[PDB]
Design a protein around this ligand. Sequence first.
Ligand SMILES: CN(CCOc1ccc(C[C@H](Nc2ccccc2C(=O)c2ccccc2)C(=O)O)cc1)c1ccccn1
Length: 250
Amino acid sequence: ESADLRALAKHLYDSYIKSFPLTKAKARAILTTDKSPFVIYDMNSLMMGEKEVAIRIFQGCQFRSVEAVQEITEYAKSIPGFVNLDLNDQVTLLKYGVHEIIYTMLASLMNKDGVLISEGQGFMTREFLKSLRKPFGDFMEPKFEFAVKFNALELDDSDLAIFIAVIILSGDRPGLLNVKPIEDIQDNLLQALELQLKLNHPESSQLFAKLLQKMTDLRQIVTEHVQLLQVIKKTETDMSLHPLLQEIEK
Ligand SMILES: CN(CCOc1ccc(C[C@H](Nc2ccccc2C(=O)c2ccccc2)C(=O)O)cc1)c1ccccn1
């Protein structure tokens, strides 16, 4: 029954709103004047924005990634069936899905010229980020490239809540014990997302299929990021990575 798929879409949107304090809707209202962001565009304004700069920015990003992980974890528990799965598998799903979600959600805070930071209070420009040191100057560019074309789908928060749930419940992650109950949940989530996109974007042909194709882009970004992490580890032996993030990327 489609009525059941609507109730599922509503439950997940409700949980998403409860779990993620900075939504796409809020981000778009900031980026498009009730509270305008301070703009970090150069090495000078970063001072007034308030251990070299590149590393400082990187750790800021690290810090925000761990809060995102906390937030994503909370949302995952709201996905019906998720907490009933084998504990090891829950860990497995989160481990491999978390970065994908982060990048997906990071696009909501981005436009072609930059990205919102510190809960929307700031806006760090694209050029500034790209002119960083050596190994850091190119953490954020592939992010920006994905965001530009993901943001072209014009998904709103209610779409993204279902899509993020589809991502968590894959079933093709490495080392999963009981693949079949995961796939049974993803199958229900896929059904709800399909109905959601048809109702919310009726003019937007094959949006469902176009959204699923975007999972290839997320995979490569994660891959690329992990390589950079390995580069950073060895040329910055005096810099610490956060263990929650360090555990995640095995
Ligand atoms: C708390 N803090 C940093 C201040 O807060 C910031 C933390 C990070 C940043 C850079 C920026 N990260 C964000 C920061 C705030 C809000 C959103 C983002 C997103 O870009 C984001 C979201 C998820 C994952 C990664 C990035 C970036 O990496 O593009 C700017 C500011 C520190 C860091 C070191 C020492 C002391 N105090």
